[PDB]
Amino acid sequence: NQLAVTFREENTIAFRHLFLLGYSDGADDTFAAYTREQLYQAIFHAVDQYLALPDVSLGRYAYVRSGLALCQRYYHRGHVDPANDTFDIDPMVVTDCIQVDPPEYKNLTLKFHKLVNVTIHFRLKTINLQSLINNEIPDCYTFSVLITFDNKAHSGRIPISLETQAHIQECKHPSV
């Protein structure tokens, strides 16, 4: 089991290196963007990487399906004018997504003045071959990847995180 806990954590760590531009171990809770170009770059790197996955990954990952949802969230209405010290805000959070299908989004225009966050969602399928070592049959994993560029604090600093969730089932038909 814990060798499978390590399988989820190992795969997630790999995802951070693969999809998080400029990521390096130990940076998890300080990793963040501070400029618009930094943020656009991080977003485009994560999607491009997703699209190049078959050619660059050291793991054999399979796409699931639309494949990737690039979503930005912002206030339905956001007039923020710190200069004349006022604002007119409608707190309802609106979601705008761009679907990306692997068999191929850069026109993306973020509404920085009232941005709540940006998320990139997608799933990846992989076989836990390691199980073969213990003479067991490999599990069929489905990873749910969630990359978040959180701006909920509206503090000029946008922390970036990558989390996952694994769905373990039994592969259709194995052969060992």
Which positions lie near a copy of itself, rule CB under 8 A? 6-7, 10-11, 13-15, 17-18, 25-26, 30, 33-37, 39, 55-63, 80-91, 112-113, 115, 125-130, 132-133, 138, 140-141, 151-158, 171-176
Smallest distance, Å, CB 69 to a copy of itself?
A: 20
How far apart are CB 85 and a copy of itself at their closest, in Å? 4
Considering the complex, state which of residue 106 and residue 173 has its C-beta at the smaller distance from a copy of itself.
173
Smallest distance from the beta carbon of 9 to a copy of itself, in angstroms? 9
Query: Which residue, 107 or 169, is less far from a copy of itself as judged by CB?
Result: 169
- CA separation, residue 102 to residues 1, 12, 50, 95, 134 (Å): 32, 20, 8, 22, 35
Check the CA dihedral 66-124-106-74 and report its sign: positive
> Within 13 Å, how many C-alpha atoms sit on residue 99's CB side?
6
If the CB atoms of residues 69 and 138 are measured against a copy of itself, the closer one turns out to be: 138
d(CA 20, CA 14): 10
CB of 106 to a copy of itself, least distance (A): 19
Q: Of the two residues 18 and 120, which places its CB atom closer to a copy of itself in the complex?
A: 18
Q: Based on CB atoms, which residue is closest to a copy of itself, 71 or 130?
A: 130
Q: Which residues contact 36 (CB under 8 A, 6 or more apart)?
A: 110, 112
* Helix 36-56 with 2-19: angle, nearest 10 deg: 120
Residue 121, CA distances (Å) to 35, 97, 124, 136, 174 in order: 22, 10, 10, 32, 29
Report the nearest approach of a copy of itself to the CB of residue 126 (Å). 5
